[PDB]
Design a protein around this ligand. Structure first.
Ligand SMILES: Cc1cn([C@H]2C[C@H](OP(=O)(O)O)[C@@H](COP(=O)(O)O)O2)c(=O)[nH]c1=O
Ligand SMILES: [Ca+2]
Length: 130
């Protein structure tokens, strides 16, 4: 029911935002359903590094919008972002580098997937959960 669409990296930003070219236009994307620590907070650097590596090493980046709001109040695109088929949002949670967060009704298709990842991260006492 959701669809992956093409994009190309313009620039890594931090754990939960990235600059991508989408339909030929530069956009800042904010990753749905997650919150990484800000760069100055604990695990912030590690979260940014993690996403910078995923995004930059990817051959193919893709954007998947949910069923709701596609842009937030700051004009950031709201999407699930995939790096060579692997969801960055979920990877962050699974590594304990983000919390599931900002779960608004109707842009929450992958909520349960991410919560499962968070439970596994917490069980493994990874990073934020250490
Ligand atoms: C993830 C997400 C954030 N936002 C807004 C809510 C928060 O508003 P406030 O700025 O007023 O706190 C902010 C959190 O983003 P950041 O975590 O990037 O700051 O982004 C949405 O509106 N929709 C979303 O899906
Ligand atoms: Ca954040």
């Amino acid at each position: 029911k959701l669809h992956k669409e093409p994009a190309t990296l313009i620039k890594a930003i931090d754990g939960d935002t990235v600059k991508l070219m989408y339909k030929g236009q530069p956009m800042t994307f904010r990753l749905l359903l997650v919150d990484t620590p800000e760069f100055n907070e604990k695990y912030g650097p590690e979260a940014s590094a993690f996403t910078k590596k995923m995004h930059e090493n990817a051959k193919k980046e893709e954007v998947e919008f949910d069923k709701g709001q596609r842009t937030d109040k700051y004009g950031r695109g709201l999407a699930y972002i995939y790096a060579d088929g692997k969801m960055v949002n979920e990877a962050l949670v699974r590594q304990g580098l983000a919390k599931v967060a900002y779960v608004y009704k109707g842009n929450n298709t992958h909520e349960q997937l991410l919560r499962k990842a968070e439970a596994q991260a917490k069980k493994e006492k990874l990073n934020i959960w250490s």
